[PDB]
Amino acid sequence: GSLTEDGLSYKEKFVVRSYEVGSNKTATVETIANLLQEVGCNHAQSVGFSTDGFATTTTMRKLHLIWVTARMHIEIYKYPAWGDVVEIETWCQSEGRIGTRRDWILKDSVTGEVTGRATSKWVMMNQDTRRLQKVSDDVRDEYLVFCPQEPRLAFPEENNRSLKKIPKLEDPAQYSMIGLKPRRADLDMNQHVNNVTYIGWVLESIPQEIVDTHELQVITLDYRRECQQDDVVDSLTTTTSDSQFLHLLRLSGDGQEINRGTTLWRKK
Amino acid sequence: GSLTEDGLSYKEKFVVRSYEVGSNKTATVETIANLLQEVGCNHAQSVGFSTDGFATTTTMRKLHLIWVTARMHIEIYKYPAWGDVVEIETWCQSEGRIGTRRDWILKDSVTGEVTGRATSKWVMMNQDTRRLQKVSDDVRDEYLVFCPQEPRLAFPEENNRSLKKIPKLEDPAQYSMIGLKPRRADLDMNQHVNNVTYIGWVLESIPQEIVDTHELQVITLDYRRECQQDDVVDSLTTTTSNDSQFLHLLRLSGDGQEINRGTTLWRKK
Ligand SMILES: COCC(=O)NCc1ccccc1
Ligand SMILES: COCC(=O)NCc1ccccc1
Ligand SMILES: COCC(=O)NCc1ccccc1
Ligand SMILES: COCC(=O)NCc1ccccc1
């Protein structure tokens, strides 16, 4: 991978692996999400950001400050097949005191056609108290030199799917998958559950009939609270309609919300 | 990746990804196992083997015959770090009517030093009845032309760890992790649980204290029965031992039907 000519974005190509594909012999949405994460990490490394905590600086490490994902939104037009090469371009942009936005464009390496796009919102917080904090000018100036100054949006539409408010699913859920627990392969280098595992858990409550007759087109996911490595999760889904679903991930005991989201599926 | 000059082995390089590493910032044993699987699949594809079923031919597909892993044995000297490049060489050799053996050598791309090795045993089975059956000369001849004829062993030693018999763990287990279920990311393109998920499930019952103070050196795993996508598994571990050794058992949560057994050897960091 490499930073582009103007140094304001980063590109990387990936060959889709045999264990990365589903029943259709095309990459899963979790494989796609892992690749967005990988290119995001390579972009931060390329410009000197910390190898201990994603997108942190010496200034943030002293203050025990981290960046956390608030929302992830992915739209796929064509899933690459096993053996195919996908090229991914990513860039970051400031969003004031609220936080930051990282966007991605996925392309077919051979044709050059856009096969997907993603956008994510990040907020700053103290890693110990878990309290959200406003980004100071000192922290802001550090990353602004690596962002384009004119708005570059993967989802430019005024009032598009990526910015829609997500409601809370009401009991009883139409479908559910309970007792979901993370194993060591679900944890990152800091022993935290990987953001991609939550996408998998959300999709666990979609009936196999939907998965067999449809392809996932859009997924929007809010990250409200972290699942600890010894927590147990219940994944809940209700049809709201193409097929549309409302999703809720909550702790198996007290029902504390960890994530909420929506999915849109297209008939094969 | 590519077949080597003589066409009797295959090499591929991989850059270790950020999500592929553990707390030590080095690749997990499941990341290593996924890469051995990937290079194994690329080698079969490079010489015309089926894209629907691993290492099958038109002859095998007609008879509903598949190859299944009976045993996997991995030894790691150094786990590659995030950003490092690992080069893997793999080859296959016939083992008579019993089945085949696929071996691997892992190397550091920069230094050229061997950082690991693996060996696996495969048996042929009817995919519908799940009945094992000896390999016929017709099936044998099809793959022999892609194998070296002189013995090429990743574990050459006459009485070595890769061929040791594994005993059945007796209750009560010293440690356990109960209620393990596969999710969709654990399934392959044919809806079967990925062979690597079983390695993860085995390791789920190792205490976190061992994982924090030791590094995994050797893992040997027998595959006895397949876990269906709606089965629930219990992972059991007992210490059998400077170095730490463990005996492992994976069985169905209800009736206790054995799916896997194995051993692990850990070295103090
Ligand atoms: C360390 O992560 C870097 C990154 O860019 N992450 C993207 C992502 C966010 C949420 C879900 C899936 C993927
Ligand atoms: C937390 O904000 C998202 C993010 O990726 N920030 C670091 C970064 C910004 C600009 C270029 C490269 C890396
Ligand atoms: C389709 O698999 C091709 C292959 O060579 N797999 C090796 C393997 C066997 C068991 C556990 C992990 C890896
Ligand atoms: C089932 O045995 C393991 C295996 O990988 N067989 C296929 C093969 C043999 C020789 C070269 C390349 C591919």
Swiss-Prot record, chain A:
Keywords: Chloroplast, Fatty acid biosynthesis, Fatty acid metabolism, Hydrolase, Lipid biosynthesis, Lipid metabolism, Plastid, Transit peptide. It is an enzyme of class 3 (hydrolase). The keyword Cytoplasm does not apply. The keyword ATP-binding does not apply. It comes from the Eukaryota. One of its GO terms (biological process) is fatty acid biosynthetic process. Its main location: plastid. It is found in: Plastid, Chloroplast. The active site is at N190, H192, C227. This is Oleoyl-acyl carrier protein thioesterase 1, chloroplastic. It comes from Arabidopsis thaliana.
